[PDB]
Write a protein that binds this ligand. Structure first.
Ligand SMILES: C[C@@H]1CN(Cc2ccc(F)cc2)[C@@H](C)CN1C(=O)c1cc2c(C(=O)C(=O)N(C)C)cn(C)c2cc1Cl
Ligand SMILES: CCCCCCCCO[C@@H]1O[C@H](CO)[C@@H](O)[C@H](O)[C@H]1O
Length: 335
């Protein structure tokens, strides 16, 4: 049977939430949407409840709601944000107006736990281990995150980590920067290297002041693209630009990451390769010697594959709304 809901004005709208969720107060000051921290009386968990905004206002709004709901419903993994609950106060499709999503309150992100300080090599092994475990899962579902950065990485005080928002500009692969039509999963590996470097050194690896500045910082660490990478460039404008570059040597990473664990440096080398086909994958990185104290080949699960074609249809609002409603009704909460 439907829970008892209660009405309580929050974020200058009337929230209606099941009574199980207690003590709602806003968090993140709108950086996350319309979100409140809550106490879930049923599970004993501190949770974040998100009231979707304007979810069926337009075709693109409707479409995006459906997508956010389907993605979250599909993600079931310790290192990826999933759903504890999804509800609407509506009894019918004709009543259906609002969607609320519930997940774990981790309560900080990566910056909020690091504060520009060098981390110990052991704490860096733990944090990167968890990103790569989570990313192995997302990638097995055939999803590319594309904007993996510290603000997208939720961390509790115990430094247990979940990846959020899955599918600044400082963590972005050069081809994402340059708006290449195609890319592979290892765009996210590039982001993990930037994150890992910054964790070890205390400092942002490529703090470009703008797009071109970033690119010059990247090229200066990893050399100008060699002959083999140039053979893979389609765009004549990009080709012309590259050849017009003054060639330069890849920097030695031992001299950039002075004093680091040599296994960390070895991993950084394998992640931060200009050519995306040549970067280590997440499943491979998880087997690298760097993570020996954490790697467990029997607890690094893969996802059932995910149909992105269902979310990129051109449908009517009412069609996307009735679909989204069926996702709500069909929700079965985790064990
Ligand atoms: C992933 C959850 C929920 N998330 C929104 C969300 C996503 C999916 C979903 F289904 C429900 C809610 C954001 C609030 C971030 N979030 C957090 O735990 C979080 C929480 C915070 C946060 C706060 O919690 C806080 O300031 N207080 C006072 C509790 C401050 N920062 C910088 C935060 C960063 C994150 Cl990532
Ligand atoms: C300054 C110019 C250097 C930018 C080089 C980025 C090269 C990234 O690598 C390229 O990734 C593409 C995916 O986007 C694939 O099409 C290619 O196979 C791969 O070589």
């Amino acid at each position: 049977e439907r829970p008892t809901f209660y009405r309580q004005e929050l974020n200058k709208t009337i929230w209606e939430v099941p009574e199980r969720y207690q003590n709602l107060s806003p968090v993140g000051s709108g950086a996350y949407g319309s979100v409140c921290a809550a106490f879930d009386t049923k599970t004993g968990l501190r949770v974040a409840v998100k009231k979707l905004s304007r979810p069926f206002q337009s075709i693109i709004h409707a479409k995006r709601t459906y997508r956010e709901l389907r993605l979250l419903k599909h993600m079931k993994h310790e290192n990826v944000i999933g759903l504890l609950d999804v509800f609407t106060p509506a009894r019918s499709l004709e009543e259906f107006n609002d969607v609320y999503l519930v997940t774990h309150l981790m309560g900080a992100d990566l910056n909020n736990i690091v504060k520009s300080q060098k981390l110990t090599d052991d704490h860096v092994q733990f944090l990167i281990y968890q990103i790569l475990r989570g990313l192995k899962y997302i990638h097995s579902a055939d999803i590319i995150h594309r904007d993996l950065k510290p603000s997208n990485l939720a961390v509790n005080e115990d430094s247990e980590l979940k990846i959020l928002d899955f599918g600044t500009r400082w963590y972005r692969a050069p081809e994402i920067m340059l708006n290449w039509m195609h890319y592979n999963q290892t765009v996210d590996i590039w982001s993990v290297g930037c994150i890992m470097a910054e964790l070890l050194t205390g400092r942002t690896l490529f703090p470009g002041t703008d797009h071109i500045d970033q690119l010059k910082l990247i090229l200066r660490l990893v050399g100008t693209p060699g002959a083999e990478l140039l053979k893979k460039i389609s765009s004549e404008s990009a080709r012309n630009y590259i050849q017009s570059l003054t060639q330069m040597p890849k920097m030695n990473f031992a001299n950039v990451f002075i004093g680091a664990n040599p296994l960390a440096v070895d991993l950084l080398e394998k992640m931060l390769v200009l050519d995306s086909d040549k970067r280590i994958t997440a499943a491979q990185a998880l087997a690298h010697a760097y993570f020996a104290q954490y790697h467990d080949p029997d607890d690094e699960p893969v996802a059932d594959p995910y149909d992105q074609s269902l979310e990129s249809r051109d449908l009517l609002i009412d069609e996307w709304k009735s679909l989204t409603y069926d996702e709500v009704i069909s929700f079965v909460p985790p064990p």
